[PDB]
Design a protein around this ligand. Structure first.
Ligand SMILES: [Zn+2]
Ligand SMILES: [Zn+2]
Lengths: 249, 1120
DNA sequence: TGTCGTCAGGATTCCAGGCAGTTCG
DNA sequence: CGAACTGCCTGGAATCCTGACGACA
């Protein structure tokens, strides 16, 4: 139960947990000898967020025993609003339900909070054949989704051999973006067959606005199977969103 | 005595305030030159100010004070009809005035029903059958809640004036009775819920019995099946007349037969018919006979059944019966400990004991005071008892309410004890107070008790509770019943189960202690596994729990709580046996030389407009005068303009600010183009030769408030304003002006206001039997300089904790009301220093300075304002009142709270022109102040004073004999959004579950709310009435035309789907927690309705959404 | 006459990219 | 002699208390 994690500057982790809170409120961080893990489902059982951070991310990391703790997303969002980019985040926990967040600098800050428990059921996602993989930049996808957000909500991604297309249909508007290997927004392609699927972009737009511009993304999808967008944190941690498309035309 | 001098000082201060107001109004900056709110001399003055005539006060006083109010009013109406003081018009006007005066006299002049609610009364003839008569009673708005008593009295006076005029009996036609019963059933089924469900035969008998027909007015736009009925001008619904007749005859039978016996008129035996129709409903122990009497008493069962009309039904606690305590008091109150540990009207009583519950630790404890209540108000496990709330006997309850079974109380117990010792040892004493030295000394010598202890016991038996040892010691001499406060509730157990209780007690550990030849005990240690703990916990006894004692569940009961259970059993000496038709107390009294009694037997159960500035559509929706001045737009209003004889300026203001005089009012014909002053209007008989229309002072024209605002700006001289809007519609007939300077001052003060025209703020009070300076926050020297020199018993005032009688002119008023009154006084002093330059009379600038002045209270349906003095305050969000300041007409008047106001506020901002022409709100207007309520000064002063803290031993002994509660002789002898609501409902369900030990069923009001919600939702969806956003008046048709042709924007629609979407989870959680039938169909129907109205478009490979609805649907599918 | 939902609306603070001042081969 | 690296600061936008509306009992 007791642990201590010290890191000089955690604005990335702050905005990450802010996006997780905007996604869902009930979340439990499992602390194991390897690091931290979290898996948040959806109240409408349509979206799944997963994150893992090993012990090669923060500066100081001392854990006693692997367990599962819970932190309120509202109480955390009421905490990250004071995180300076040049601060030293220190998360301390003992045996009692007291969580300490410490910051060292021009004034020693220390906030104590109660620790409630979360009992969300965890189940391993079954393996599914992707048949479509691609690695792109985050800024291009973010600006495309922000340009196609106001016209409609169903954005259609089509992928063929060395070809990608992001389109936005409708009745009084149409948007189209082409992507090839010699373009300025595609890093690499691993397409297998001709796939095409339309997805909603509310949670998409929120989660891609929460992520910075220089970060990269890896999309895995198929014909009509759910999409998985993954990315890496400091080349050590992993974070993946997963959500199914719509059946309509 | 000195109360007359105090009232003289009060009226002297009132006259000083009146002289100040007169000196202020002497300048004449408002269209009014006389006092609008005069003080009433008596009921004669009240009725004269209500309807008059102005000068019949002498005859009214003579007749009343010489022959009684009833025949006095009868002869007064006779004289008014005969025209003794002269003539006043036609016979119809005579009848109208007589009816109004009679009703005002019998109602004491408090109700404005005959004033405005009943506008006109005419006589009309039947041109169809035989030429009989009907009263055309042109009613008005404020008559929908005229009151059942007032409606019955109006029917009585109408029949009386009909008998006086000598009219013919109307013939009830088939079409007439058909449309009457149709309107009745329509109002009962669709319009509004009724207070008394009528019957077809009953309403037919009534409509046939009424000699002359009655024709009311229009209420709503609801048609009938038989169109064009002869007699009525339309085919609308006469719901007003329906409710009038219903609450008049079908509800007020008791007062009706009382007034019948008072008057003596024939033709009313159908009320006796209705009484008859409602009248169509060796092994013998004393407690069994009492149970048989309670079973024969149908009133408690009928009340428990009728209590199902409100609140969640079928949620009664099985441990404790559905009733509170009965404390007989002259003429409800529940201990706030139960409210803190937690549905009807509430009333606080903190000076009594509380309930007893168990905590999370497993032990059982009772609630005593506020600190312990707030401490244990969160660690409760299950509610055992409800406490001991007080219901009295002086309540005016009718409809054959049977006698509630009383209880053996400590006061009655000690009274019987002292009477027994007086008749045995020949010792005189005075109970209910401190005893004399010699008497208390001889009593202490006879009873082996302390004299000071006996004094304290006689002073307060509940506070000074004797120890159980000495209690049993003194009981062994007289064989008196047991101590009630330390007597458990045993009236719900079987002797076969009591035998197992005595077996478990014998199989337990016991230690003894005796005191003064009383072989009592010292402690009992029991194991919770030795017997069924159901009744062991339902007994409601404070025990201590222990776990680490080699045994899982151990309980221990020490003194003075173990002797209270062991000594009634005789220290387990004699053997207990089970006997039917004999309660446990009966068996105990059988197998013992001491007879006991019973304890628990009583079971009874928008828009927020601020200023008056007519702008209409010229203001749009917000109607901001600052916005209008910035835009520089005109305004087409139907308003009254003025004209100055010297300057000549025209404007809707009262006084001309350019010059130093007040401008007069000009008259204009709206149809023609002529203008004439008041002199020409009164000379031309108020008729224009151009247009033959009555000369109206106001006209419809355009004005520019943008440039007209500079006048008010330079008049107020203060430009501190942030947000301020004007009125939109005018309800008055003349549509007179309003002081713009006073409106701007009110805006800068940032206070609220109603549509009445003055400043009044709501407050809630509740009278109590006593009064304490410690609680009201006033010092002894403060009361002395106020005028109090002695206590309720003649002793001087030196102690702050001096229990006193409830003073009449005292106010227990909350801090919010105090702050609002402070802001009102600030605005008042600001206006009186900026309007005329008058010195501040009150000079109030702090919270404590307001104590001493005079305010006015007013309830709905009360056209008279009760003048009270500001003596007191309050810390809690509620307050207390006086039984004279709060009467029955102020309690059952469609409102429990009352509005408070200041005298200067009324004197400065009151104007009859602020009253609508035909309709009216909850009240007409605070026309007249009243302060004299002399409660039999020279006749029954002892009756008025001696009301508190008396216990009738006679009725306490004669309560288990099925006495008649309507015994007037014995009565006189003894007298002599969503979050808060959802959380509250869930917490109420949870606490009910804790109390009933996790055993409940479904409710019915949830469906009674959902089904009408679903139907209304469907009707709104099929109607789809839209409204243009900026075009606020033009309602767009459901046929969509793209956009509003006058406003190229969106059109606001009435979706009404967000409420049901939030109510669905409530029913879902309810049906998931408890399983019930007859409603899964409704649940699946509403869910599928939402689904196919939207027609859940995305689904993953792993679904399995848990839903009890889908579970039950699949179960029914498999069963099919 | 009490309650409950929706909508827009303008005033507010928070975030981000352009204008400007500044130390590096 | 030019290029990143900040401040900062002001535009753009998300949030929200207030002001309209309708629904039931
Ligand atoms: Zn003038
Ligand atoms: Zn005219």
């Amino acid at each position: 139960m007791p642990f201590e994690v010290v890191f000089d500057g955690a604005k990335e982790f702050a905005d990450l947990i802010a996006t997780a809170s905007n996604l869902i409120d009930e979340a439990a961080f499992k602390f194991t000898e390897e690091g931290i893990s979290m898996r948040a489902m959806d109240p409408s059982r349509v979206v799944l967020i997963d994150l893992n951070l090993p012990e090669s991310i923060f500066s100081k990391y001392e854990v006693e025993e692997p367990e599962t703790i819970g932190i309120n997303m509202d109480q955390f969002k009421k905490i990250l609003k004071r995180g300076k980019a040049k601060d030293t985040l220190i998360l301390r926990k003992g045996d009692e339900n007291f969580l300490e967040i410490t910051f060292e600098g021009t004034a020693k800050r220390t906030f104590r909070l109660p620790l409630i428990d979360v009992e969300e059921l965890e189940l391993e996602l079954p393996e599914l054949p992707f048949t479509a993989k691609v690695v792109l930049l985050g800024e291009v996808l973010k600006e495309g989704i922000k340009d196609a957000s106001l016209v409609s909500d169903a954005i259609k991604f089509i992928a063929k051999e060395n070809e990608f297309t992001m389109k936005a249909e409708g009745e009084t508007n149409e948007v189209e973006i082409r992507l090839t290997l010699e373009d300025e927004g595609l890093l690499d392609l691993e397409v297998e067959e001709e796939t095409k699927s339309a997805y909603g972009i509310r949670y998409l737009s929120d989660m891609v606005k929460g992520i910075g511009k220089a970060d990269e993304v890896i999309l895995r999808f198929g014909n009509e199977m759910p999409l998985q967008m993954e990315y890496m944190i400091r080349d050590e941690g992993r974070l993946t969103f997963l959500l199914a498309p719509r059946v309509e035309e | 005595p000195e109360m007359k001098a105090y009232f003289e000082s009060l009226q002297r201060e009132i006259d000083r305030a009146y002289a100040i107001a007169r000196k202020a109004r002497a300048q004449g900056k408002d269209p009014s030159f006389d006092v609008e709110v005069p003080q009433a001399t008596d009921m004669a003055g009240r009725v004269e100010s209500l309807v008059g005539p102005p000068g019949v006060a002498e005859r009214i006083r003579e007749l009343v004070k010489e022959y009684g109010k009833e025949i006095a009013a009868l002869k007064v109406v006779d004289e008014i009809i005969e025209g003794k003081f002269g003539d006043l018009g036609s016979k119809e006007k005579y009848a109208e005035q007589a009816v109004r005066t009679a009703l005002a006299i019998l109602t004491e002049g408090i109700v404005s029903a005959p004033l405005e609610g009943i506008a006109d009364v005419k006589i009309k003839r039947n041109e169809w059958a035989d030429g009989s008569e009907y009263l055309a009673l042109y009613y008005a708005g404020p008559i929908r809640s005229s009151g059942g008593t007032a409606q019955a009295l109006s029917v009585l006076v109408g029949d009386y004036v009909r008998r006086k005029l000598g009219l013919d009996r109307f013939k009830p036609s088939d079409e007439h009775i058909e449309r009457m019963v149709e309107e009745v059933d329509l109002y009962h089924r669709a319009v509004t819920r009724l207070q008394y469900h009528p019957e077809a035969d009953e309403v037919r008998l009534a409509m046939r019995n009424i000699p002359i027909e009655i024709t009311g007015e229009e209420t709503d736009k609801v048609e009938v099946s038989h169109r064009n009925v002869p007699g009525v001008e339309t085919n609308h619904l006469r719901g007003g007349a329906i409710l009038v007749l219903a609450e008049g005859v079908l509800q007020k039978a008791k007062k009706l037969v009382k007034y019948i016996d008072k008057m003596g008129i024939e033709g009313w035996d159908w009320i006796k018919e209705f009484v008859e129709a409602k009248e169509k409903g060796v092994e013998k122990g004393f407690y069994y006979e009492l149970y048989e009497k309670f079973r024969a008493n149908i009133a408690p069962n009928k009340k428990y059944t009728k209590e199902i009309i409100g609140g969640r039904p079928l949620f009664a606690e099985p441990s404790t019966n559905g009733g509170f305590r009965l404390r007989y008091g002259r003429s409800w109150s529940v201990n706030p400990a139960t409210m803190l540990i937690l549905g009807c009207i509430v009333t606080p009583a903190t000076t009594v004991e509380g309930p007893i519950v168990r905590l999370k630790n497993g032990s059982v404890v009772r609630v005593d005071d506020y600190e312990t209540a707030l401490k244990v108000r969160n660690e409760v496990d299950e509610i055992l008892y409800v406490g001991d709330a007080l219901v009295n006997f002086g309540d005016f309850v009718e409809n054959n309410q049977t006698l509630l079974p009383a209880n053996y109380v400590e006061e009655w117990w000690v009274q019987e004890l002292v009477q027994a010792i007086k008749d045995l040892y020949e010792v005189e004493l005075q109970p209910f107070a401190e005893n004399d030295r010699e008497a208390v000394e001889e009593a202490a010598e006879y009873l082996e008790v302390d004299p000071d202890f006996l004094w304290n016991l006689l002073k307060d038996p509940l506070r000074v509770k004797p120890d159980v040892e000495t209690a049993i010691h003194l009981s062994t001499v007289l064989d008196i019943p047991f101590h009630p406060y330390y007597t458990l509730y045993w009236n719900t157990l079987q002797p076969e189960e009591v035998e197992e209780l005595q077996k478990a007690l014998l199989g337990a550990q016991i230690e003894w202690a005796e005191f003064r030849k009383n072989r009592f005990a010292k402690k009992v240690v029991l194991e919770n596994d030795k017997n069924i703990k159901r009744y062991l916990e339902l007994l409601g006894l404070p025990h201590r729990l222990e776990r680490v004692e080699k045994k899982r569940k151990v309980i221990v009961v020490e003194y003075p709580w173990s002797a209270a259970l062991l000594t009634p059993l005789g220290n387990l000496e004699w053997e207990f046996k089970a006997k039917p038709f004999y309660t446990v107390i009966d068996i105990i009294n059988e197998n013992n030389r001491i007879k006991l009694r019973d304890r628990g037997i009583s079971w009874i159960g928008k828009p927020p407009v601020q200023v008056l500035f007519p702008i209409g559509l010229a203001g749009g929706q917000s109607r901001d005068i600052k916005k209008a001045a910035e835009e520089g737009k005109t305004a087409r209003v139907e308003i009254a303009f003025f004209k100055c004889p010297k300057c000549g300026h025209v404007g809707p203001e009262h006084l001309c600010p350019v010059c130093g005089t007040r401008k007069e009012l000009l008259w204009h014909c709206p149809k023609c183009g002529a203008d004439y002053p008041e002199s020409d209007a009164k000379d031309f008989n108020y008729r224009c030769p151009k247009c033959d229309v009555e000369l109206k002072p106001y006209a419809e024209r355009e004005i520019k408030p943008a440039d007209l605002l500079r006048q008010a700006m330079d008049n107020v001289k203060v430009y501190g304003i942030d947000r301020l809007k004007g009125v939109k519609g005018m309800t008055s007939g003349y549509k007179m002006a309003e002081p713009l300077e006073k409106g701007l001052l009110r805006v800068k003060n940032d206070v609220y206001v109603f549509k009445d025209g003055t400043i009044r703020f709501d407050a809630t009070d509740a009278p109590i039997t006593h009064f304490k300076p410690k609680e009201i926050g006033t010092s002894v020297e403060k009361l002395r300089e106020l005028g109090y020199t002695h206590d309720f018993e003649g002793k001087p005032l030196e102690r702050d904790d001096q229990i006193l009688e409830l003073k009449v002119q005292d106010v227990i008023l909350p801090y919010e009301a105090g702050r609002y009154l402070l802001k009102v006084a600030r605005f008042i002093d600001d206006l009186l220093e900026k309007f005329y330059g008058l010195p501040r009379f009150y000079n109030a600038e702090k919270m404590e300075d307001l104590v001493g002045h005079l305010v006015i209270g007013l309830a709905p349906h009360t056209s008279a304002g009760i003048i009270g003095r500001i003596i007191g305050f309050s810390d809690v969000l509620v307050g207390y009142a006086h039984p004279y300041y709060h009467a029955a007409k102020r309690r059952n008047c469609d409102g429990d709270e009352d509005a408070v106001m200041l005298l200067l506020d009324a004197l400065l901002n009151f104007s009859k022109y602020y009253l609508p022409e035909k309709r009216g709100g909850k009240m007409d207007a605070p026309l007249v102040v009243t302060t004299r309520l002399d409660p039999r000064e020279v006749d029954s002063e002892v009756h008025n004073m001696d009301v508190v803290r008396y216990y009738p031993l006679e009725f306490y002994k004669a309560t288990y004999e099925l006495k008649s509660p309507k015994e007037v002789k014995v009565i006189e002898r003894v007298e002599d959004g969503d979050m808060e609501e959802k959380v509250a409902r869930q917490l109420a369900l949870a606490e009910r579950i804790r109390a009933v030990d996790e055993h409940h069923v479904a409710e019915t009001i949830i469906n009674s709310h959902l089904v009408p919600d679903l139907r209304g939702n469907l009707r709104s969806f099929t109607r789809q009435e839209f409204r243009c956003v900026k075009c606020n008046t033009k309602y767009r048709r459901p046929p969509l035309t793209g956009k509003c042709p006058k406003c190229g924007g969106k059109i606001v629609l009435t979706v009404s789907k967000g409420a049901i979407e939030k109510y669905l989870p409530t029913a879902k959680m309810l049906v998931t927690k408890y399983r019930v039938k007859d409603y899964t169909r409704q649940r699946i129907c509403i869910t599928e309705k939402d689904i196919k109205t939207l027609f859940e478009k995305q689904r993953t490979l792993m679904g399995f959404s848990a839903d009890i609805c889908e579970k039950m649907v699949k179960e029914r599918t498999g069963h099919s």
